[PDB]
Amino acid sequence: SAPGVYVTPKNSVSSDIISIDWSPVQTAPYTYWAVHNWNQGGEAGGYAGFQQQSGFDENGKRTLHFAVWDPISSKEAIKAEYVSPTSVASNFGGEGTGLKIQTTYDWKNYNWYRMTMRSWQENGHTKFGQWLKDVSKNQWKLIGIMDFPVPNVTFNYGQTLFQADWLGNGQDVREARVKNGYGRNISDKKWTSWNTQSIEGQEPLNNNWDGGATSEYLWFKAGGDSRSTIGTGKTFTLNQPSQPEIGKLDYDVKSTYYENEKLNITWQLKDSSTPQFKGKIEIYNNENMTGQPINVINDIKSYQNGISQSISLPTNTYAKIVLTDIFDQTVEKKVKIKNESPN
């Protein structure tokens, strides 16, 4: 009932990582800020963002949202591979069909939240993952991963943000801000900066919305006494760097021992680290890690913090722990395996 508002990059391209920063200002109930959108009308169509599901403030139900529509070219189901502790996966229907993950998340007005999605190929399927950085708390969280049963799909086209009223409370104002929009290109793994974006009301004949920019962010609002100062829409440019500011992967190894024919290797990322994408461990029979490993543990997931494995090992082994973050930064540590360690 409030008119929709779309904020669209001028220069987006097919991507495997998409990122934007968002801050809520006015939060009417029944508002979805879908900060990422992809593949509309197409294979692996989806979106993700933030909702005010009820109430006008922090005492209402505030959530993250993530949905992918059912495959066109397969009868196989989308799987919810991982959901965070405050996340719930369910099948949606009556609006096409597909999978959504709704996550209770206590986001706050005038604070910034970075939503970063990554898509990757694995096992002949495509995975889509949702990560969120609470900027004020300097903390990343893995929210959910969907396993889509079609290969070679990406965030191919259609990058945009919308603010929408889904229930019909047009008297109530909704307003938010965005900045730091970036994609990682499929073509060359370089970053594209969405420094120029267009703000445009959904209904050309409805001016009950507004938008603009400061030096730091784009802002938009709709509903109530909102009235456009920019006609049907306008393009704005932010002074963001051509390259995104990417943190560092940093972790502590917490165990590395072998006892009673069980190998246990675990770690904890620092609270200030970029989030874990994947891990691998190679076990060598020698300190220099020459030759072939005697054992390899592959495909440790984003949501796994190490291994416990029934295994036979000789006396003097060494572990090569190779962790990679969601930005493909790798940090490798070598650790001597403590033979007997509860002991």
Next chain:
Amino acid sequence: AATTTTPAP
């Protein structure tokens, strides 16, 4: 209940 999108026009 529904949270729609648009296809390209």
